[PDB]
Amino acid sequence: PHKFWNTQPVVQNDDSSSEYSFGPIEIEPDSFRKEIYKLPDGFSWFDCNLWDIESQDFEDTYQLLKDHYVEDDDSQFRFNYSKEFLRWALCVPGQKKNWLVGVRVNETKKMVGFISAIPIKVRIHNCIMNTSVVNFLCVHKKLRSKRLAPVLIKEITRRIRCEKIFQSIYTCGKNITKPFTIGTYWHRIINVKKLLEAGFIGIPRNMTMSSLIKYHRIPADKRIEGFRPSVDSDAEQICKLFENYFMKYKDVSNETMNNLINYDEINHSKELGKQAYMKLDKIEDLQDKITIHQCFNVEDVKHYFTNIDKVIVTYVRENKNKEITDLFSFFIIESTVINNERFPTINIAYSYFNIANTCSLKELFNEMLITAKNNNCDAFNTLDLMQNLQVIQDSKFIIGTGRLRYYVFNWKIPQISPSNVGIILF
Ligand SMILES: CCCCCCCCCCCCCC(=O)SCCNC(=O)CCNC(=O)[C@H](O)C(C)(C)COP(=O)(O)OP(=O)(O)OC[C@H]1O[C@@H](n2cnc3c(N)ncnc32)[C@H](O)[C@@H]1OP(=O)(O)O
Ligand SMILES: Cc1csc(NC(=O)c2cccc3[nH]c(-c4ccccc4N4CCNCC4)nc23)n1
Numbered sequence: 282p283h284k285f286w287n288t289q290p291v292v293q294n295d296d297s298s299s300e301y302s303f304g305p306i307e308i309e310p311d312s313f314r315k316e317i318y319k320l321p322d323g324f325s326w327f328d329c330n331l332w333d334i335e336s337q338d339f340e341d342t343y344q345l346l347k348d349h350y351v352e353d354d355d356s357q358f359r360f361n362y363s364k365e366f367l368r369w370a371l372c373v374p375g376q377k378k379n380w381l382v383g384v385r386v387n388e389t390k391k392m393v394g395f396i397s398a399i400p401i402k403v404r405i406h407n408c409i410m411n412t413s414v415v416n417f418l419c420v421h422k423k424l425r426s427k428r429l430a431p432v433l434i435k436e437i438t439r440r441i442r443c444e445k446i447f448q449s450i451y452t453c454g455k456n457i458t459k460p461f462t463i464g465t466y467w468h469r470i471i472n473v474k475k476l477l478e479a480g481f482i483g484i485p486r487n488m489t490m491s492s493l494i495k496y497h498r499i500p501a502d503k504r505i506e507g508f509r510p511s512v513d514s515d516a517e518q519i520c521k522l523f524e525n526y527f528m529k530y531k532d533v534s535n536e537t538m539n540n541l542i543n544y545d546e547i548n549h550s551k552e553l554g555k556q557a558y559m560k561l562d563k564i565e566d567l568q569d570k571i572t573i574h575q576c577f578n579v580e581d582v583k584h585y586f587t588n589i590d591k592v593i594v595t596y597v598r599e600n601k602n603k604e605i606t607d608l609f610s611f612f613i614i615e616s617t618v619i620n621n622e623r624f625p626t627i628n629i630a631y632s633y634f635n636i637a638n639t640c641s642l643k644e645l646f647n648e649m650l651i652t653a654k655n656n657n658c659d660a661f662n663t664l665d666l667m668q669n670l671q672v673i674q675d676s677k678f679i680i681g682t683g684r685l686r687y688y689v690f691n692w693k694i695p696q697i698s699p700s701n702v703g704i705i706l707f
């Protein structure tokens with residue numbers, strides 16, 4: 282029984298709609314609460330100054346997440362996002378100062394809560410829109426189970442709506458309301474001895490450390506040439522590469538892709554916003570296609586698909602005309618090994634966006650796995666989004682624990698396969 286989520290414009294688990302459709306759940310451009318939400322006495326909101334990596338706010342945020350953010354099931358690993366990562370992930374083109382929200386104890390100046398939104402452009406079927414991604418919701422462990430989280434969620438909702446944005450995308454490792462897709466975690470072991478020492482895997486009875494090393498080795502043969510790190514001057518080419526990829530896997534006609542309904546222009550009117558509703562005759566119309574994905578202009582490409590040591594790795598393949606034809610990318614997050622004083626962290630790569638045109642996706646990932654090994658990553662993690670199952674199948678990836686639930690706030694999306702989703706959250 283929910284007490285907060287049952288009041289929100291999201292599809293509920295008990296929803297009994299017998300039709301597949303798309304569109305906003307509600308069009309309420311001026312009826313939302315505009316007054317700041319009250320925090321418990323002694324606590325105050327503040328806009329978190331992540332615009333200078335040396336600021337005190339950035340140290341406070343880094344420390345809060347380091348000790349209190351997402352942990353695995355058994356509380357053996359906790360994410361340890363670096364400050365350079367958080368800057369790359371949160372100070373994105375178009376970001377607003379007030380979408381990085383902290384909660385501080387007034388007497389001690391201790392930061393005890395955080396929630397963030399980043400602006401992104403997304404296509405959802407026949408619509409395109411400026412939207413938000415909510416991430417890094419975090420409450421101090423000593424303040425949990427006191428119903429603070431709905432306060433932080435309502436407050437970021439208010440701050441997003443003040444920017445005339447009424448939808449959001451977010452993920453969760455547990456079921457809340459009805460998710461529009463469910464992602465499966467997959468792990469590729471790179472550094473066996475480190476992951477054994479960390480307790481992530483163990484040594485099977487029918488194996489040895491040496492046979493494990495042998496089994497999990499990244500294949501060294503069949504190397505395809507032409508790959509190099511991306512640079513800023515690649516941005517226009519990379520932008521075109523992404524447009525052609527999303528055009529290839531579209532779930533709407535060519536004319537539709539070229540004339541997407543821009544919800545930003547009609548979300549101010551209950552009558553005009555109705556144009557965004559779209560009934561789907563057959564669910565099979567979407568099979569093998571991408572239905573929802575982020576859209577990147579040249580400025581976004583320059584920011585996201587770059588190379589920052591220990592944060593983000595982007596390589597492109599060139600042909601004999603020196604034209605970019607393929608791309609792989611992954612970001613890098615350390616995790617704390619909670620109960621290991623002498624081996625306190627591991628370095629994990631996470632697949633981001635990958636486009637294979639001149640090679641198979643399996644060959645592309647093999648080149649990416651080698652590069653992640655050479656970037657000192659102990660494992661390579663992926664979701665079964667987009668065409669990744671092609672590589673996950675008949676590979677040495679091992680399934681993870683739990684599932685990643687995808688949600689859209691104030692939009693209707695039929696339950697779809699993760700192959701239909703091109704949205705990666707940090
Ligand atoms: C138009 C714009 C819209 C913008 C907003 C879009 C929505 C954004 C939504 C957020 C996007 C998250 C994206 C990410 O960052 S996902 C990762 C979230 N962060 C962590 O897991 C870090 C460690 N954990 C914690 O810090 C706390 O446990 C948190 C802060 C998560 C909850 O603290 P606490 O454990 O002290 O709980 P409570 O007593 O205060 O409150 C209980 C209520 O909160 C609901 N709850 C609990 N966890 C989540 C969750 N992860 N998403 C959504 N709802 C959640 C729960 O169902 C219940 O409601 P109801 O079941 O009674 O109804
Ligand atoms: C090799 C190794 C050692 S520890 C480790 N993962 C943890 O500890 C851990 C703990 C909690 C949640 C997790 N989700 C994932 C993950 C795994 C694969 C693909 C995406 C993933 N997520 C990352 C975060 N954003 C959304 C997508 N991993 C964890 N992997």
Ligand SMILES: [Cl-]
Nearest residue numbers: 317318319320
């Ligand atoms: Cl209030």
Ligand SMILES: [Cl-]
Nearest residue numbers: 456460463686
């Ligand atoms: Cl679920």
